[PDB]
Amino acid sequence: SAMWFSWGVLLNFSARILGMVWAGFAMIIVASYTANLAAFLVLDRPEERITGINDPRLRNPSDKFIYATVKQSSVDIYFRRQVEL
Amino acid sequence: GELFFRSGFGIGMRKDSPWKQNVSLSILKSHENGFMEDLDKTWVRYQEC
Amino acid sequence: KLVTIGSGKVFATTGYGIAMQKDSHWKRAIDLALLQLLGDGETQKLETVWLSGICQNEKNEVMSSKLDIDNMAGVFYMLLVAMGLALLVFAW
Amino acid sequence: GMMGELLSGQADMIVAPLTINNERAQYIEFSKPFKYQGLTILVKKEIPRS
Ligand SMILES: *[C@@H]1O[C@H](CO)[C@@H](O[C@@H]2O[C@H](CO)[C@@H](O)[C@H](O)[C@H]2NC(C)=O)[C@H](O)[C@H]1NC(C)=O
């Protein structure tokens, strides 16, 4: 009867009015969930690693960031000679 | 919202003068309590929008 | 996951100083040199080198804790309105 | 200006938003700063408006 219509209202006397206002509620909640998820999958983006050599993570070593170069190379000399590195 | 060359407003006087130390101490005391905050509320933080 | 209340905007707003013995003759030269360093931007370089945390202040918009008070309030509003309409139909 | 008036003896104290810097400190002595603030840029909201 009208029970299935309820389930289907989302897609398809005063009982029809109540069904209409309930369908409006259904549409508004679906739009709300859509906007929520759209903001969800946009805002989450971990850039973390900064392209810079001036990144604070590189300047301050920590357990979660491990970085190194080839031993006994030009990079080793370059990092050795500068006292601020 | 940017800022550069952060500096301060102080009170100028001549070379070594009797009022220097007490002026500095009074300013520090006013900073310690809320007097400078009261002045900021009265003159700077009163906005119309 | 740590943030400060605003940014130190209603508080004592003092500064770090170099303590010296009273009547020391180093005070004039030290204050002049500190003012020169502050004006030249070397102090800003030091702040960049040392007082710099993860990226910037990391506003990061909404990291977590989704807020949807408008949606639930509207939900309850519609349910109450519907039940009131049903009660009005009962009245007739 | 105010620096010249103070140094010439016309005044005994400058009670004004006078910025502390090394150029002025070589000739006069400032108190501890009663305000902390930097330089900034003033503009308008859009060409006419949003
Ligand atoms: C600066 O403030 C100090 C506060 O200690 C003043 O020193 C006192 O001055 C009164 C003047 O009547 C004397 O009776 C006290 O014996 C002083 N005490 C000390 C510890 O010095 C000082 O006079 C003030 N200077 C100026 C120029 O106002």
Could you give a short account of the major beta sheet of chain C?
none
Radius of gyration of chain C: 29 Å
Report the radius of gyration of chain A as a whole number of Å. Answer: 30 Å
| Assembly annotation | part of a larger assembly
Separation, N- and C-terminal Cα atoms of chain A: 77 Å
* Topology, number of strands of chain C: 0
Q: Main β-sheet of chain A, in a few words?
A: none
Helix vs. strand class of chain C: mainly alpha
Overall 3D form of chain A: rod-shaped
Number of helices of chain C: 3
PDB class: membrane protein
Keywords: NMDA receptor, GluN2C, GluN2A, membrane protein
Entry title: Structure of the Rat tri-heteromeric GluN1-GluN2A-GluN2C NMDA receptor in complex with glycine and glutamate
Chains A, B, D: Glutamate receptor ionotropic, NMDA 1
Provide a short characterization of the protein structure.
Chain A is 58% helix and 0% strand. Chain A has 85 residues and is an all-alpha fold.
Task: Characterise this structure.
This is part of a larger assembly, with 3 copies of chain A and 1 copy of chain C (92 residues). Chain A has 85 residues and is mainly alpha-helical. Helix content of chain A is 58%, strand content 0%. The termini of chain A are far apart. Chain C is an all-alpha fold and 92 residues long. Classes of the chains: A mainly alpha (85), C mainly alpha (92). Chain B binds chain D through residues 2-17, 19-20, 23-24, 27-28, 30-31, 36, and chain D through 2-3, 6-7, 12-21, 24, 27-41. Bound molecules: a molecule of 2 linked components (NAG-NAG). A molecule of 2 linked components (NAG-NAG) is lined by residues 18-19, 22 of chain B. It is classed as membrane protein.
Task: Give the helices and strands, then pairings.
This is part of a larger assembly, with 3 copies of chain A and 1 copy of chain C (92 residues).
Chain A: H1 2-8, H2 14-43, H3 56-59, H4 74-81
Chain C: H1 26-40, H2 42-49, H3 69-91
Bound molecules: a molecule of 2 linked components (NAG-NAG).
A molecule of 2 linked components (NAG-NAG) binds next to loops of chain B.
